[PDB]
């Protein structure tokens, strides 16, 4: 049975999606998600598809930004795995959080 | 409708930069808002130049200010060049 | 050419190039016989020991050496599936799947002969279903087609011959090469058609040339040599000499006929007409829905066994197998390949998927079944269809107009693109000469293009059909629902709902829900219970709740105890499936075996459902029904009465529901009952589907094969009464017949009901469970 | 019990783990630990609270019912984010 050590596929997958342009989240589950936060503000809202897409594109440009920084948070503690600690600190450090 | 953008002037600077390139159509637009945004940033900066100076127009001086400001290093100093000479050869025809 | 402006800028050059090769990550990386299916399983594995320890439960290893299973290898033909032991094996691919069905096969197969709460209906269900899946793998056994053959070397063997067999239920992908002396020894009818399809006598290569030079068609009283089959009736043969009549004139046409009278004879009819009479044996493509695939199939197979009918789904592999094994007689070439086939199958969804392999192909003739799907000139299977290179086109429907006449027009140019025009439609309000004027240009127009025949002027045995409008009034719940949602009342809908998430787009949608049922919405039902069943909901107040709730229902519930007093079986269809599933939970709680139908059941369970509701000794009495779903292929024979609980927008799809119980040779009088809300928005869609009505019975029904009357009808406004007994007879069945109720609390929930209710509660607190 | 609710909650779930997976690796994120994946899905939920509030407000300003990518633009310029390639 052929195999491949654990990390060099994870290479293969950052080599992937870092040449790769399209949004890496699902089209109609963002869009629920996206429904489900607007109708706690104002109850029947219509939405334009532009208005979804552009949505994404922010809410996917500020994860991967969110995870460079988690990876350096990681890597600054001397380990190669990404823990919710190194996102508290991304975002402390950052502002967002406190 | 009529809707103004700065598409064919955009193109027309690219086929001095790069006669043989095309461009697509979410490319124009993101050269459009790119164009619109720095506009407003320098429009912005030479208002509250104006404002903080307690004079009422907007001059060159106060768009070669803002692009000083807001334009980081040598961006800037090619640019206030650029400007410069097309203000004077401006001046050499009207 | 050169760029006239530079950047004096002197930044450093930047490589741009984001392309990448993992060739240097190869110190990890890589620098066909295995277990596939598991088929069938044998108590004895190898000796029957005895008839001793056959109580408790088996594990793992003792099912490992006590059971052999049928398998069938990778890449294997299901001819050598071999019956197979744990050690027999050792170590090949695919052993967990092995695991997988050993396990979980063996864990409910025990866990239900082991369980005392074990009812005969589910051993049954589980038993035949059990067969279904042994005899469609037992099915695979037998070939199909032979697609090709060849000699091959084999290991010091000299030359063999070896076939390229297909098989009955699966598709080109899984083809294999096979020895001929099993094929031969197996079925050799198929064979002698291989080389009967090798050297065969008709070619798209040896076609005609009829270039606006055909000869004129004579009538044939008399089935033509050529189409075997078995029996041809005369409407069949007058059809048949229509489209002839239409070939010869070089006119496109509508098969407009009426479901169930055989549509798919008469086109395999006149296609083997085209190939063996006017020797037009070219490429033909006929699309047809892929539910109705099989009855095409066996017809090609039975009617005209001499035609090379091919067939074109499957995924990329499969149609790539079809495209480059058997399209063309000389594949290996590379200029013009000419085709090998006849007809070829396929379906709307591989017309779209390979308009580039399928468009560039020299097409004789084009059959497009189902035509109402092509209703839409925007839709992408307009332009799909439409770019296609075909001299001669047909449709086949049984709605040529649904909701307007533009779906005609769209029709029509598709048929003919530039000679028949329409630019306006139709009003009820103008009564004018000029409609008549047009509408009898209309009539006058594609009268020859058209050939309709109806269910009643043809095979004269089947008995009437008779649908009661039943308006009934609204309930309290609905009737301040109703008010609520049409005087918007967020701060009132919303009252004792902790989410308080009501949406109020498509208003009527909702008004719609508001006059089907109340418990529709989120949060409804339990105010109806803390208010009238003061919210103990101990197993009888429920279903009295359920009665209350819906003012459409109450006759609902007393139409089915007086049919559950006579002998015949009610099917219900309505649009939404949440409503159905609101009458299955009261069917549930009431206690009537009932099966339902929507678009979430897969066809498998969907052809079960269907056997265990035809079947001569079923206990079902009521079969719930989505109005859309499945379209013309499910039989409902056994079924007697409809009832409309929704009614649709477009009415066709009323037709086909309601012709599911009402098809050919039925030997009861079916009973339609339409379940209408009084002073609703239901009100207006039934006004559209009776003008929709009057549209079709104008200009379709008078011109198959008075006006200012029917014209006076459509512009007005419609707006023992459940007995199973029954120009002017169109305006039968248009009739509003208002049902009064006046049923309070505690007329619902008799004596005997409910004392039947507190007994099975009884039982089932002794119980617990 | 065939009837349900009509309205769906667990929307933040259909931000999947092999989404978040995707996400990080184009980020550079080798190794994933279990306990990301709720964090990314809370995190992504208050930026979505942030933005989509702001652009209600916008929207609810110009009278209308319908939320536009142009408002979209201006939700994410006010926080600091601006957007290129969707108008403005």
Same mark, same amino acid.
């Not at chain 3, 239900?112 to 099915?139: H, K």
């Not at chain 3, 609520?484 to 967020?490: A, E, F």
């Given at each position: 049975?052929?195999?491949?050590?654990?990390?060099?596929?994870?290479?293969?997958?950052?080599?992937?999606?870092?040449?790769?342009?399209?949004?890496?989240?699902?089209?109609?589950?963002?869009?629920?998600?996206?429904?489900?936060?607007?109708?706690?503000?104002?109850?029947?809202?219509?939405?334009?598809?532009?208005?979804?897409?552009?949505?994404?594109?922010?809410?996917?440009?500020?994860?991967?930004?969110?995870?460079?920084?988690?990876?350096?948070?990681? #890597?600054?503690?001397?380990?190669?795995? #990404?823990?919710?600690?190194? #996102?508290?600190?991304?975002?402390?450090?950052?502002?967002?959080?406190? | 409708?009529? @809707?103004?953008?700065?598409?064919?002037?955009?193109? @027309?600077?690219?086929?001095?930069?790069?006669?043989?390139?095309?461009?697509?159509?979410?490319?124009?637009?993101?050269?459009?808002?790119?164009?619109?945004?720095?506009?407003?940033?320098?429009?912005?900066?030479?208002?509250?130049?104006?404002?903080?100076? +307690?004079?009422?127009?907007?001059?060159?001086?106060?768009?070669?200010?803002?692009?000083?400001?807001?334009?980081?290093?040598?961006?800037?100093?090619?640019?206030?060049?650029?400007?410069?000479?097309?203000?004077?050869?401006?001046?050499?025809? +009207? | 050419?050169?760029?006239?402006?530079?950047?004096?800028?002197?930044?450093?050059?930047?490589?741009?190039?984001?392309?990448?090769?993992?060739?240097?990550?190869?110190?990890?990386?890589?620098?066909?016989?295995?277990?596939? &299916?598991?088929?069938?399983?044998?108590?004895?594995?190898?000796?029957?020991?005895?008839?001793?320890?056959?109580?408790?439960?088996?594990?793992?290893?003792?099912?490992?050496?006590?059971?052999?299973?049928?398998?069938?290898?990778?890449?294997?033909?299901?001819?050598?599936?071999?019956?197979?032991?744990?050690?027999?094996?050792?170590?090949?691919?695919?052993?967990?799947?092995?695991?997988?069905?050993?396990?979980?096969?063996?864990?409910?197969?025990?866990?239900?002969?082991?369980?005392?709460?074990?009812?005969?209906?589910?051993?049954?269900?589980?038993?035949?279903?059990?067969?279904?899946?042994?005899?469609?793998?037992?099915?695979?056994?037998?070939?199909?087609?032979?697609?090709?053959?060849?000699? !091959?070397?084999?290991?010091?063997?000299?030359?063999?011959?070896?076939?390229?067999?297909?098989?009955?239920?699966?598709? =080109?992908?899984?083809?294999?090469?096979?020895?001929?002396?099993?094929?031969?020894?197996?079925?050799?009818?198929?064979?002698?058609?291989?080389?009967?399809?090798?050297?065969?006598?008709?070619?798209?290569?040896?076609?005609?040339?009829?270039?606006?030079?055909?000869?004129?068609?004579?009538?044939?009283?008399?089935?033509?040599?050529?189409?075997?089959?078995?029996?041809?009736?005369?409407?069949?043969?007058?059809?048949?000499?229509?489209?002839?009549?239409?070939?010869?004139?070089?006119?496109?046409?509508?098969?407009?006929?009426?479901?169930?009278?055989?549509?798919?004879?008469?086109?395999?009819?006149?296609?083997?007409?085209?190939?063996?009479?006017?020797?037009?044996?070219?490429?033909?493509?006929?699309?047809?829905?892929?539910?109705?695939?099989? !009855?095409?199939?066996?017809?090609?197979?039975?009617?005209?066994?001499?035609?090379?009918?091919?067939?074109?789904?499957?995924?990329?592999?499969?149609?790539?197998?079809?495209?480059? =094994?058997?399209?063309?007689?000389?594949?290996?070439?590379?200029?013009?390949?000419?085709?090998?086939?006849?007809?070829?199958?396929?379906?709307?969804?591989?017309?779209?998927?390979?308009?580039?392999?399928?468009?560039?192909?020299?097409?004789? *003739?084009?059959?497009?079944?189902?035509?109402?799907?092509?209703?839409?000139?925007?839709?992408?299977?307009?332009?799909?269809?439409?770019?296609?290179?075909?001299?001669?086109?047909?449709?086949?429907?049984?709605?040529?107009?649904?909701?307007? &006449?533009?779906?005609?027009?769209?029709?029509?140019? *598709?048929?003919?693109?530039?000679?028949?025009?329409?630019?306006?439609?139709?009003?009820?309000?103008?009564?004018?000469?000029?409609?008549?004027?047009?509408?009898?240009?209309?009539?006058?127009?594609?009268?020859?293009? &058209?050939?309709?025949?109806?269910?009643?002027?043809?095979?004269?045995?089947?008995?009437?059909?008779?649908?009661?409008?039943?308006?009934?009034?609204?309930?309290?719940?609905?009737?301040?629902?109703?008010?609520? &949602?049409?005087?918007?009342?967020?701060?009132?809908?919303?009252?004792?709902?902790?989410?308080?998430?009501?949406?109020?787009?498509?208003?009527?949608?909702?008004?719609?829900?508001?006059?089907?049922?109340?418990?529709?919405?989120?949060?409804?039902?339990?105010?109806?219970?803390?208010?009238?069943?003061?919210?103990?909901?101990?197993?009888?107040?429920?279903?009295?709740?359920?009665?209350?709730?819906?003012?459409?229902?109450?006759?609902?519930?007393?139409?089915?105890?007086?049919?559950?007093?006579?002998?015949?079986?009610?099917?219900?269809?309505?649009?939404?499936?949440?409503?159905?599933?609101?009458?299955?939970?009261?069917?549930?709680?009431?206690?009537?075996?009932?099966?339902?139908?929507?678009?979430?059941?897969?066809?498998?369970?969907?052809?079960?459902?269907?056997?265990?509701?035809?079947?001569?000794?079923?206990?079902?009495?009521? *079969?719930?029904?989505?109005?859309?779903?499945?379209?013309?292929?499910?039989?409902?024979?056994?079924?007697?009465?409809?009832?409309?609980?929704?009614?649709?927008?477009?009415?066709?799809?009323?037709?086909?529901?309601?012709?599911?119980?009402?098809?050919?040779?039925?030997?009861?009088?079916?009973?339609?009952?339409?379940?209408?809300?009084?002073?609703?928005?239901?009100?207006?869609?039934?006004?559209?589907?009776?003008?929709?009505?009057?549209?079709?019975?104008?200009?379709?029904?008078?011109?198959?094969?008075?006006?200012?009357?029917?014209?006076? *009808?459509?512009?007005?406004?419609?707006?023992?009464?459940?007995?199973?007994?029954?120009?002017?007879?169109?305006?039968?069945?248009?009739?509003?017949?208002?049902?009064?109720?006046?049923?309070?609390?505690?007329?619902?929930?008799?004596?005997?009901?409910?004392?039947?209710?507190?007994?099975?509660?009884?039982?089932?607190?002794?119980?617990?469970? | 019990?065939?009837?349900?609710?009509?309205?769906?909650?667990?929307?933040?779930?259909?931000?999947?783990?092999?989404?978040?997976?995707?996400?990080?690796?184009?980020?550079?994120?080798?190794?994933?630990?279990?306990?990301?994946?709720?964090?990314?899905?809370?995190?992504?939920?208050?930026?979505?609270?942030?933005?989509?509030?702001?652009?209600?407000?916008?929207?609810?300003?110009?009278?209308?019912?319908?939320?536009?990518?142009?408002?979209?633009?201006?939700?994410?310029?006010?926080? /600091?984010?601006?957007?290129?390639?969707? /108008?403005?």
């Amino acid at each position: 049975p052929h195999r491949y050590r654990p990390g060099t596929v994870a290479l293969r997958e950052i080599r992937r999606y870092q040449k790769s342009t399209e949004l890496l989240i699902r089209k109609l589950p963002f869009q629920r998600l996206v429904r489900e936060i607007a109708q706690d503000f104002k109850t029947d809202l219509r939405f334009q598809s532009s208005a979804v897409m552009a949505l994404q594109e922010a809410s996917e440009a500020y994860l991967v930004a969110l995870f460079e920084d988690t990876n350096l948070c990681a #890597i600054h503690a001397k380990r190669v795995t #990404i823990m919710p600690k190194d #996102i508290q600190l991304a975002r402390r450090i950052r502002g967002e959080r406190a | 409708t009529r @809707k103004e953008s700065y598409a064919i002037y955009v193109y @027309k600077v690219l086929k001095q930069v790069h006669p043989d390139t095309g461009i697509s159509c979410k490319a124009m637009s993101i050269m459009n808002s790119f164009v619109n945004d720095v506009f407003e940033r320098i429009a912005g900066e030479a208002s509250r130049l104006a404002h903080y100076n +307690k004079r009422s127009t907007i001059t060159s001086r106060e768009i070669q200010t803002a692009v000083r400001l807001l334009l980081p290093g040598e961006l800037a100093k090619h640019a206030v060049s650029e400007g410069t000479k097309a203000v004077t050869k401006y001046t050499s025809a +009207k | 050419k050169i760029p006239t402006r530079f950047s004096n800028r002197q930044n450093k050059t930047v490589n741009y190039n984001i392309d990448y090769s993992d060739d240097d990550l190869l110190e990890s990386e890589d620098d066909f016989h295995g277990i596939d &299916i598991v088929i069938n399983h044998r108590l004895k594995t190898s000796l029957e020991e005895g008839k001793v320890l056959e109580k408790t439960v088996p594990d793992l290893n003792n099912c490992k050496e006590n059971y052999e299973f049928l398998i069938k290898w990778t890449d294997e033909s299901h001819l050598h599936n071999t019956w197979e032991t744990y050690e027999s094996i050792g170590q090949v691919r695919g052993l967990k799947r092995l695991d997988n069905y050993c396990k979980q096969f063996i864990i409910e197969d025990q866990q239900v002969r082991l369980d005392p709460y074990v009812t005969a209906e589910d051993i049954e269900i589980m038993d035949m279903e059990r067969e279904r899946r042994l005899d469609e793998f037992e099915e695979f056994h037998v070939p199909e087609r032979i697609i090709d053959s060849q000699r !091959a070397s084999l290991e010091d063997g000299t030359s063999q011959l070896q076939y390229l067999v297909k098989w009955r239920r699966l598709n =080109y992908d899984e083809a294999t090469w096979e020895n001929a002396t099993d094929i031969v020894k197996l079925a050799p009818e198929q064979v002698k058609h291989f080389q009967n399809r090798e050297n065969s006598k008709i070619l798209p290569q040896y076609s005609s040339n009829y270039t606006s030079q055909r000869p004129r068609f004579e009538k044939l009283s008399v089935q033509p040599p050529f189409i075997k089959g078995g029996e041809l009736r005369d409407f069949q043969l007058t059809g048949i000499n229509w489209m002839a009549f239409l070939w010869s004139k070089g006119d496109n046409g509508i098969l407009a006929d009426e479901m169930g009278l055989g549509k798919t004879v008469q086109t395999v009819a006149f296609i083997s007409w085209l190939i063996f009479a006017r020797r037009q044996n070219g490429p033909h493509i006929i699309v047809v829905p892929l539910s109705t695939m099989p !009855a095409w199939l066996d017809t090609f197979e039975k009617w005209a066994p001499d035609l090379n009918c091919i067939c074109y789904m499957g995924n990329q592999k499969s149609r790539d197998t079809i495209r480059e =094994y058997e399209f063309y007689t000389n594949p290996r070439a590379k200029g013009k390949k000419t085709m090998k086939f006849n007809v070829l199958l396929t379906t709307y969804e591989y017309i779209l998927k390979d308009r580039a392999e399928l468009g560039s192909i020299k097409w004789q *003739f084009m059959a497009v079944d189902e035509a109402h799907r092509l209703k839409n000139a925007e839709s992408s299977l307009y332009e799909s269809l439409n770019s296609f290179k075909v001299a001669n086109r047909m449709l086949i429907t049984g709605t040529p107009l649904q909701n307007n &006449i533009k779906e005609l027009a769209a029709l029509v140019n *598709f048929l003919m693109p530039g000679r028949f025009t329409i630019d306006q439609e139709i009003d009820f309000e103008n009564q004018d000469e000029e409609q008549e004027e047009y509408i009898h240009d209309l009539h006058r127009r594609i009268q020859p293009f &058209i050939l309709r025949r109806l269910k009643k002027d043809v095979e004269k045995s089947l008995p009437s059909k008779t649908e009661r409008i039943l308006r009934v009034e609204l309930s309290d719940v609905q009737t301040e629902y109703y008010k609520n &949602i049409l005087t918007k009342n967020y701060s009132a809908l919303t009252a004792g709902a902790k989410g308080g998430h009501f949406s109020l787009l498509n208003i009527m949608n909702e008004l719609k829900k508001a006059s089907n049922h109340p418990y529709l919405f989120d949060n409804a039902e339990e105010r109806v219970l803390q208010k009238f069943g003061d919210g103990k909901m101990t197993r009888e107040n429920v279903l009295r709740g359920l009665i209350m709730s819906s003012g459409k229902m109450v006759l609902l519930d007393q139409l089915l105890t007086r049919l559950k007093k006579d002998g015949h079986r009610v099917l219900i269809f309505s649009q939404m499936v949440r409503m159905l599933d609101i009458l299955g939970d009261y069917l549930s709680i009431k206690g009537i075996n009932f099966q339902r139908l929507d678009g979430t059941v897969p066809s498998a369970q969907r052809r079960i459902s269907i056997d265990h509701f035809n079947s001569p000794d079923s206990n079902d009495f009521v *079969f719930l029904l989505s109005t859309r779903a499945g379209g013309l292929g499910i039989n409902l024979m056994t079924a007697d009465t409809v009832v409309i609980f929704d009614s649709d927008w477009n009415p066709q799809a009323d037709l086909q529901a309601m012709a599911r119980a009402h098809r050919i040779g039925q030997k009861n009088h079916v009973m339609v009952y339409r379940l209408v809300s009084k002073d609703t928005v239901e009100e207006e869609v039934l006004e559209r589907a009776r003008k929709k009505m009057i549209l079709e019975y104008a200009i379709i029904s008078l011109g198959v094969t008075e006006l200012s009357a029917i014209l006076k *009808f459509g512009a007005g406004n419609m707006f023992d009464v459940l007995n199973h007994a029954e120009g002017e007879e169109f305006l039968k069945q248009f009739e509003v017949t208002d049902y009064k109720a006046d049923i309070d609390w505690d007329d619902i929930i008799p004596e005997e009901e409910l004392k039947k209710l507190q007994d099975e509660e009884q039982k089932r607190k002794d119980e617990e469970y | 019990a065939k009837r349900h609710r009509k309205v769906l909650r667990d929307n933040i779930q259909g931000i999947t783990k092999p989404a978040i997976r995707r996400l990080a690796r184009r980020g550079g994120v080798k190794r994933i630990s279990g306990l990301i994946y709720e964090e990314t899905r809370g995190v992504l939920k208050v930026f979505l609270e942030n933005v989509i509030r702001d652009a209600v407000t916008y929207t609810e300003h110009a009278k209308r019912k319908t939320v536009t990518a142009m408002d979209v633009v201006y939700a994410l310029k006010r926080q /600091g984010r601006t957007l290129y390639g969707f /108008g403005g």
